[model samples]
Target: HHSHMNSCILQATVVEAPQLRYAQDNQTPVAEMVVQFPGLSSDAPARLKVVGWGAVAQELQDRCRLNDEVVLEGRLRIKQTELTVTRVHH
Candidate 1:
């Protein structure tokens, strides 16, 4: 038997520039950024943290900029929201 997991697909604007850094081991790459989108109910916009790994991180660092919009597809987690970017559109 198998269990279904929770996942979120979001189209959000990059509220902040991507911050890329190397892992402590100095091999793996990590990229972190904040994204914001319209709230489901309230008028206030919802902001969330997004993290990427490896080639995705590098791509984000090279292509993404503040206010850029991207389509993010990944699993959601507690404490922070990490996403694997499926596409970067404008």
Candidate 2:
């Protein structure tokens, strides 16, 4: 068995197009994606706002778009609204 840790796996459809741009350093890039999916018993849809950094951001932002179905398998390293996406495939 694995130890307790922070992980995130989301299945949703893009509601907004990914916005990729430079980081604070102005050299590195970050990608932001807003998606919505069904909630757990709340019945109302929930939106997931996450960010992709580095190559993952580059790839995800380039390929993913609004109305596209996607799955986010990335660790939630931040309490803020952003992260590192290990994988994103539609």
Candidate 3:
């Protein structure tokens, strides 16, 4: 009980409305949205697919807004290039 996946934090702005939904069979709550990193050398905004589960999903759907800034901690599914959120900053 001493290890975890590589988690990272990103400060970004919501680029699209979160799509909140439940799993068909499991009925697990989940949410998906796009976010853009403000700046990091590239002049263009870097887009990412951010994901949230359970309570985070609910919060995302209810509170997230376009261009709203947020900081989050999560592990990235490296191959898929998506973030699986664990904690959020409103």
Candidate with top TM-score is 3
- Model 3 lDDT per residue over 1-90, tens place: 228757789998999889988977667899999898955676787889999989889888888899899998888876568888888897
Higher-scoring candidate on lDDT, 1 or 2: 2
Model 2 quality (TM-score): 0.80
Off by over 4 Å in 3: 1-3
Score every model by TM-score.
0.80, 0.80, 0.85
**Clash totals, every prediction:** 0, 0, 0
- Provide the lDDT at 35 for model 2: 87
Cα lDDT for residue 69, candidate 1: 79
User: What is the alpha-carbon RMSD of candidate 3 to the true structure?
Assistant: 2.1
Q: Evaluate residue 51 in candidate 1 and report its C-alpha lDDT on the 0 to 100 scale.
A: 82
Tens digits of per-residue lDDT for model 1 on 28-48? 898988899989887799888
Clashes of 1: 0
- Winning candidate number (lDDT): 3
Q: Alpha-carbon error at 54 in model 2, in Å?
A: 0.5
Clashing pairs in 3: none
Candidates' lDDT values, in order? 0.79, 0.81, 0.86
